[PDB]
Design a protein around this ligand. Structure first.
Ligand code: M0N
Ligand code: M0N
Ligand code: MG
Ligand code: MG
Ligand code: MG
Ligand code: MG
Lengths: 291, 290
């Protein structure tokens, strides 16, 4: 009698969700919340001319996707720090962080319908959202597979660049394409910026450590731009031993500074991968500065 | 020059993705596919919705993707070594690849949504349905995980547990049903009762199968239906030491057969929670039968 009634009031309503419940599961996200991406949206806008109301929502959407991606990336990469602070999954656990991060992807999708009331356009914005997230996951999927199944596949410079067009280019293209569709193409340019962004991120990760950083990419074992170069150069030049030692070090998932410094000096003096990467970056930057 | 030419051909094209790459990224999802009743429920419900087989195939594909992906993540979240007898994906391909593949399918599934209709309003409603229910799924799943991991900061009551279930399990049940009802040329209450019966029966069988089943729920330490009842029953009957012993076993995250038996025996002899649960499920099935 009273039970059947309670159950009947239950199944005949939307599920109950409290602001307290909301707060409790947003902890991993609130943690990572502690302007440049915002600055990038603004400069792009000096061309896209979106009104401030909309620029604002484009921003909220991009921050949510961006922060969610990092929460997950740190789980995927087993990173202990992000922005000099302890990583969310280590504080709240992998379970909550994965769920909160995926939760936010969906809150992000929800925000898209606050951009328009035009059914044709809205459909377009969603397809953009859907497409760049699909691309993001593909790049990230390759990067993780190459790394976790090494030495199964040794990627070439070409493969690495295609993985980067997907992985990083994904959110760059997403932001700009939403804006371009909202404007009352800068895709190639934004693609080049993402590539430069990723190769500089790979490089400085070792160059900072070498100069003084943690070179956490070595610990992770990633097929970074410098590593891909060193791995193919050594294969090509008959340096069997170096090629193997590079792989062994990546596969140690080591935190020892000396072992990391040894790998880095291999890329500096033996394969010349650091100079190569440095130069490749400049060449890319000049492709713009000489536009 | 030749370097610039290539970077140019690169950035002016769509990102390259091959069938082989698509294959690599799929390994974690395909592994869980080796595991018809879901399909039958769709078939059966359709005798009321009458969607054209073509359209019904996509809804089905969408549902299999959401369901499979959420199971891939659920195993990582519950630290499960097994799923229907086979080794779970994360233990074979790793947590990183399994998470990313599951997440990629969520999005592949979202894409299959616009292949359901081209009618613009109708499509908006389909996306909104998809969005709303995946949000609910994550909310309940998130609260279910919060209670377990923060235990014993919060011990839910039977009412809290039911609202977690309405979000957690009701999510994909309703997403399915609501999409069909929208594409049909309201069974929601019924589908809501179904998900609840399903989750309580799921929590129930996990202990029972072990009593007659590894009772992984004890190891996971979750606030299942019989456990919530036991916790609240011993608190109400002021049975301090039993209440505590239940919490202690759950916090052990134990694999020990003997310790697992003990908690189940506290639930059989002390609180009569398993029986209380059998009775709760039977009353729920009755609202449908009668
Ligand atoms: O951890 P960072 O900041 O160094 C890193 O750059 C993070 C990163 C790059 N690209 C993506 C795409 C989605 C999510 C995270 N992403 P990486 O690729 O090196 O993990
Ligand atoms: O692991 P199972 O199969 O026993 C389980 O039933 C899996 C389950 C139930 N409801 C959801 C919602 C989202 C993802 C997984 N879900 P549980 O709730 O016990 O994790
Ligand atoms: Mg990464
Ligand atoms: Mg990382
Ligand atoms: Mg589970
Ligand atoms: Mg679970």
């Amino acid at each position: 009698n009273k039970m059947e009634a309670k159950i009947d009031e239950l199944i005949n309503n939307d599920p109950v969700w409290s602001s307290q419940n909301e707060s409790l599961i947003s902890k991993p996200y609130n943690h990572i919340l502690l302007n440049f991406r915002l600055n990038l949206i603004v400069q792009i806008n000096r061309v896209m001319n979106l009104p401030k109301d909309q620029l604002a929502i484009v921003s909220q959407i991009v921050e949510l996707l961006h922060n969610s991606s990092l929460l997950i990336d740190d789980i995927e990469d087993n990173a202990p720090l992000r922005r000099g602070q302890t990583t969310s999954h280590l504080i709240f656990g992998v379970p909550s962080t994965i769920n909160t991060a995926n939760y936010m992807y969906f809150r992000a999708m929800q925000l898209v319908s606050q951009l328009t009331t035009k059914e044709p356009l809205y459909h377009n914005l969603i397809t953009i959202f859907n497409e760049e997230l699909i691309n993001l996951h593909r790049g990230q999927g390759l990067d993780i597979y190459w790394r976790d199944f090494l030495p199964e596949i040794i990627p070439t410079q070409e493969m690495y660049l295609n993985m980067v067009m997907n992985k990083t280019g994904g959110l760059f293209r997403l932001t700009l394409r939403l804006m371009e569709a909202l404007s009352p193409s800068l895709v190639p340019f934004i693609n080049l910026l993402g590539i430069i962004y990723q190769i500089r991120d790979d490089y400085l990760n070792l160059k900072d450590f070498q100069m003084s950083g943690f070179a956490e990419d070595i610990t992770e074992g990633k097929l970074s731009f410098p590593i891909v170069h060193a791995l193919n150069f050594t294969k090509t030049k008959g340096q069997t031993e170096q090629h193997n030692e590079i792989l062994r070090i990546l596969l140690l998932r080591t935190s020892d500074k000396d072992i990391k410094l040894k790998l880095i000096q291999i890329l500096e003096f033996d394969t010349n991968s650091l100079a190569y990467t440095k130069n490749f970056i400049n060449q890319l930057v000049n492709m713009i500065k000489n536009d």
